[PDB]
């Protein structure tokens, strides 16, 4: 049988840093799928399916939840997201557990015109709101649980798999960065609104000139930076 | 083919899924029974000049499409699905807001017969007895330079509702031919503002001094008297209104019925969670609170699964703990003023 | 020989109650078709003469909804020795745009002829909904379709894709168009009622609506179809114009009993399948026809009433001890229940 | 030798009433086509010459509905020693879009030539409904996109006509004859002639000349005005300048007068009334229409504003009751007097 | 050796009247092509210069001599050539001819000698018709321009063999485009602030000061086109990548009446010589007097269809003679200033 | 050993004048490719910028100094699988024909996908978004069957280039706001600033699918060639424009002299027509037309161009034997 959802949540916390709220609901939901199987091994319960409502770790959460762990974009399955295609998927979702990822705008219920005596956007999701976004009502009825994901800040610095130090190490040179300012390098991803995918691009920009000067005919000592993204990059020389 | 179940045996089936709407269930039971009975009664000198001297022929029986009238969330499409599932006939839903006249960017009229044939799993002869639910037909009404959508779609359905050949692409440019001559069409709409047309026709007063019980039953009372004379005035084309000879009024759900929808239907929300092992008690005043909360949220019975799922999230995590023999919900717990009882 | 037009009329007269003029025109037109195709079908030039080739004369049918325009088409087609196609002008578009190609009209006819090309070239094509292609960025579904049909109607070598393409010569194919032409009586009224506007000269300066609707439509002329928005090219090659009249109570009472597939014999059959006899008395027939006029949808009104009256018998009769059901003027007036006679 | 224009004109004159100008143009044009055919059948820059190559002049036929445009084209095509194709421009679309490709015009000409390419390269092509290709955002996939696609064909070019499956047809000597109604062109010519103006325009011409049926006025007004059609008016109608320039010969067919409609009933081959009395021959019945009724029928037909096709609409309307009652009624003859046409009588019957 | 540009010019002069600038550009470009082909056939050193190509665009109005220049130059070329029409083509994956058909047609002319095809000249007619529409998948519009970019600049292309494909490299193939570009004058004038609203200090000319009305429209259109610039073709609907690699641009001018009078008699295949060749078959002589030709050229100029308007006049005048001569005893047809004016019937000299 | 990046940079500087930044990124990325070839992570490259900026010139010159196999491809040829036209896998097939089918070496190659903006989506495409969905299976590693052998793309480095004409306008609608209240060189440099702030969310709006943009982690916008660069391009680079015309004249035994003040005059005229460094050729052909016609087979021995000739105020000078 499956483990209790509290232990599922703990293992999800081993690879997803934030989203403790979403991790809790998903843990409660998927446990209710697999338990019915071990009951089969007043009508029986209908199948349970999830909406995971950019760049977020929602696919990583489903993978950390893992079963075949199959995934796709457009046992268990996972999916992204015309009305013809949604009607066709509705014939298959009726089988194995599935997850639909996505993002949307205007899902709030939407003031007074006279005198009188986001967490706000996505905690109050309604089927009537998902219908207003144009999903087919019968397909919305196939996805009865909607979990909202956290907008990703320390988690950007706290995630793990500055890892480029191995590339300079292959150049016989050290690399380091001032953690007390790395929060400002991570904050550039927050103002770019890249999500977590921006990190790789940002590193390729700041390190470019170091990567041009360090490789040869140059001092092998450690490169260093502090607030350099806010200045010029420093180095020791040897 | 197979013998249709009598209307009362259909009515007792719909009674298991759709709360309260006795009159709609009655009319639909008779209409569906008649439709498949006559198909079973006109089933296969037949052509050419020999017909001129044909001394007699079998009376061909002709179909009677349906119009469902009523507020949103009142079970219109829920009924049509139970109707289909009561007879295993293929069933399709078309959102008429999406259609446009041929030549233009929207979806074409004939795409509905394709998804019927898919629902029939390409068994053409079973696709060709199906039920096609035309949803939101109120929204292709004519507006008061070409009315694509609108009147343009109404005039395009006219020889779909009556029998005509349509070409449908196969499962794989090759196509199969589906003949709509025996498909039952069930239009549906919330004809918003039709009550004003009826009352104005019926010589009832709603303005000025001396206009003058239930809060909204006055609209259900009045919609019951709908007739073709004023579906035309709403903006439906006469050619189109004439092809939908059966009209069915559906009333709005009360909180009295929403409390029944929580327990009573075969797919009710509460029996699902209450079926879990090591488990719920829900106080009857909590059911009333949930019903009022749905109305106050102004979400229909579709909302009941949403509110109840949000209340039971915290028990569902804790409940594997062996000390939880019972989880209890009460009137003030639904109000969020108290934590659920763990005992 | 082909059947004389007085024999074809006697066949149409069995299904269509009114409209003795439209029966007469269609009967002669089919008779002339057979005479033509026998006549018309088995360089440097000088001769004293060549054999006279008979041209064709396409037909246009006009009249209100529920008047019998499609019933005349579907009745005639059963007694044709040549192939036929019935098709809808609302599906077509001009070339290059999404829609049906106009040549599909002939492809459907070639299929009906079982791909015997030399037989398809003798067929008859019924174009329904011809008023919907009237003129109003190209008019891809309107004037663009009218101007594409021009050389189908006069006759050309058409490439038909079937079963590579097949060349079908439409020179001998006869086309019959039909439409309601809503608002053409208004155009005819202007044509003959309007006088001079100003001070003229030194001499002389300074259901009765439905009755007029039919009396005025009888005077339709080519100038009125051109004002309605059919282009002169197209009106010029539909030379035979045929106005159908609306239906009175005197006919609606007659449509209930008299023709083949009459409205009540259909319901008597549905009750006969339940071993039940339905009695509608003569005084009820007048009332059912009286109510059917205020449905404003022609002979389709009759079944909308019958489906409302019989709802209770049709629910209670199946598997019951009832042996006969009796409908009287009081029942039609809505002030009594239908009488049940029991075994 | 090829037949002289006189001989060809005398053939067209047997089927088409009036339009002596269009008959002359078509007769001289095909005579010149034979003369061009029989004549036309490294790099060095000096000391060399070339014999004169004759070049075709494509034709455009303009005119009202029902006036003889397609009749002239069809009765001419029966008199050609050289392959021909007749086709409808409304079927064509720009390359890459659904519909018939513009080179299908040449493919059906090659089929007419039994795939003898060197004979197809001499053919005559009749393009009906050329006004519907008028220009009028979005691609004009049929219309302006078809006009600019035909420029390859109206001048000399090599077409990869499909039966590789493609046979190259050199379209240089192929002669094109276009037809259209150009509905509304006279409204363009009058505005060109300053016959519509605002303000005083005082330098303009004085026009103060010596004082110089209601349907006949409109017919004479339009027919007067088309005779002045020019290239600059086809451009304003929406033909592409490249497209007008390579249709050098413009022929306005005049509208049919009432006096000509009386001839069309009796006089030409396959005339309207000879067809109907031939229909009565199968019923062993005569039809007699009298020379006073003929003028009455032509007068009613002119009011249909639809050319010679109006004559059929009336004949079908008068004879309907005879044609229904005659087939087995021992009727020996049907008599139509002027009073029958005016609706003051039923058609008289002679009983056997 | 290559023929010098004045020799090619003196040949073009025998067929085309009054396009001396385009005759120069084509003559120099053909000379540069041969001259370039003869030449073009860690650090690095001792590599020779490569002589890149300068493709040509011909812009002038309808009936101005664009195709006639192309069709005459194709007789001077001692190297393979292909003439093709841009309205046939569509982008890859859609029905119609591929862009690569342009090079296959060139390879056929070279008898599939790839080395000789690889230095040929390609004439693209009707290049204005692939101009994009003012988003859409323009299968035959902009999508054709995007496909041509890799031909106009040098790339290896696989063309289907006559039988399989063979590679050929467009790097030395010279492309000559032409089009009418109807409406470009309305773009150049709007670029020149000739449609500006309100007051403004800078003024360039004292316009006016002059004084047949159809002659002024011709003079204006010729003036604007003489100032055509890449900024305009990008506004007409050509893409910047496409305009940028047609470096040489050649506005042909419209034809004066002074020129139309010359085109009637002067060239090879001139209009009047080839009409009187038709009467020669009927054993008849057509005489047009020198003051009738001026009257014909006036009437033709008003047609707004260029030199191909001349035969529209000639077909209108001679229709009666051509119908009445061909089996008669008429020996000569005489035309004069009054016959062309329509005051008079053409003179018939009887046997 | 791998060439240091400032060695490659000094090679690129022999051919490309303008973009001292894009030279650095390419030199670093080519070094990293060599350095990732053993003890093996990649980032693919997208070259944005104006027409005639040097995008194809950068790619085509870099391939001259490259040991690893390379392929040059135009995305305008590709189509969805099963339609007529070139198959997307043929991009790798052209690479495998380089280095003579050594699959062990081909897996380390560099692929230059030019004209990637032309497969942009549009608001069933045989090109467009249909082609992009295929390239994902190349940019992310897959074992692709090639005419047969299987080639792993995992270590292939893809470079992309495109003009993205109109992408500046897409950024403009994102980067600025139409506030309302109390609170030529200028047209070109306004774009050079704006295009420098391109972000992945803008390339998605241009019609590149979100996964395809994510597979191109580093975007390199080439700047527009200003007049100070264009004048240098005339004299300075290998195969410089004017040395080509001097060769065309010198084989007529004629010397072409262009004064330094004419060069500055040519460069201004080229800046106006906004077709990049190709504008230089359009003016030189316009200016030199008359002497190229008159000079061959003539006694002229030198042609002199000066700022009055470029300005149209004078005819070209001729000197004769
Ligand atoms: N400058 C000219 N000199 C002599 N004849 C001319 C001249 N221009 C046109 N012609 C005559 O007109 C005919 C058509 O000219 P041409 O094909 O060159 O026009 P074009 O400008 O290419 O037209 P389009 O824009 O329609 O393609 C020539 O064959 C010739 O008879
Ligand atoms: N920065 C430069 N330095 C030197 N020469 C240049 C430069 N930019 C352009 N050129 C010259 O101009 C030509 C056009 O530039 P290039 O080939 O790089 O095209 P591109 O910028 O990629 O444009 P397109 O979008 O048309 O492909 C070059 O091949 C070269 O001859
Ligand atoms: N009378 C009812 N009895 C039981 N369930 C209902 C009833 N009305 C609505 N529902 C619930 O509401 C959902 C939405 O369906 P429905 O109300 O039929 O759509 P519509 O708004 O088109 O009528 C149904 O799936 C069903 O779960
Ligand atoms: Mg009908
Ligand atoms: Mg015609
Ligand atoms: Mg030309
Ligand atoms: Mg480039």
Curated annotation (Swiss-Prot), chain E:
One of its GO terms (cellular component) is mitochondrial nucleoid. Higher expression in skeletal muscle and heart and to a lesser extent in liver, brain, placenta, lung, kidney and pancreas. One of its GO terms (molecular function) is ATP binding. It is found in: Mitochondrion; Mitochondrion matrix, Mitochondrion nucleoid. Residues 344-351 have a biased composition (Basic and acidic residues). ATP binds at residues 61-68. Coiled coil: none annotated. Keywords: Acetylation, ATP-binding, Chaperone, Disease variant, Hydrolase, Metal-binding, Mitochondrion, Mitochondrion nucleoid, Nucleotide-binding, Phosphoprotein, Transit peptide, Zinc. Its EC number is 3.6.4.10. One of its GO terms (biological process) is proteolysis. The modification N6-acetyllysine is found at residue 195. It is an enzyme of class 3 (hydrolase). Belongs to the ClpX chaperone family. ATP-dependent chaperone that functions as an unfoldase. As part of the ClpXP protease complex, it recognizes specific protein substrates, unfolds them using energy derived from ATP hydrolysis, and then translocates them to the proteolytic subunit (CLPP) of the ClpXP complex for degradation. Thanks to its chaperone activity, it also functions in the incorporation of the pyridoxal phosphate cofactor into 5-aminolevulinate synthase, thereby activating 5-aminolevulinate (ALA) synthesis, the first step in heme biosynthesis. It is linked to Protoporphyria, erythropoietic, 2: An autosomal dominant form of porphyria with onset in infancy. Porphyrias are inherited defects in the biosynthesis of heme, resulting in the accumulation and increased excretion of porphyrins or porphyrin precursors. They are classified as erythropoietic or hepatic, depending on whether the enzyme deficiency occurs in red blood cells or in the liver. This is ATP-dependent clpX-like chaperone, mitochondrial. It comes from Homo sapiens. The chain holds residues 165 to 605 of 633 of the full protein.
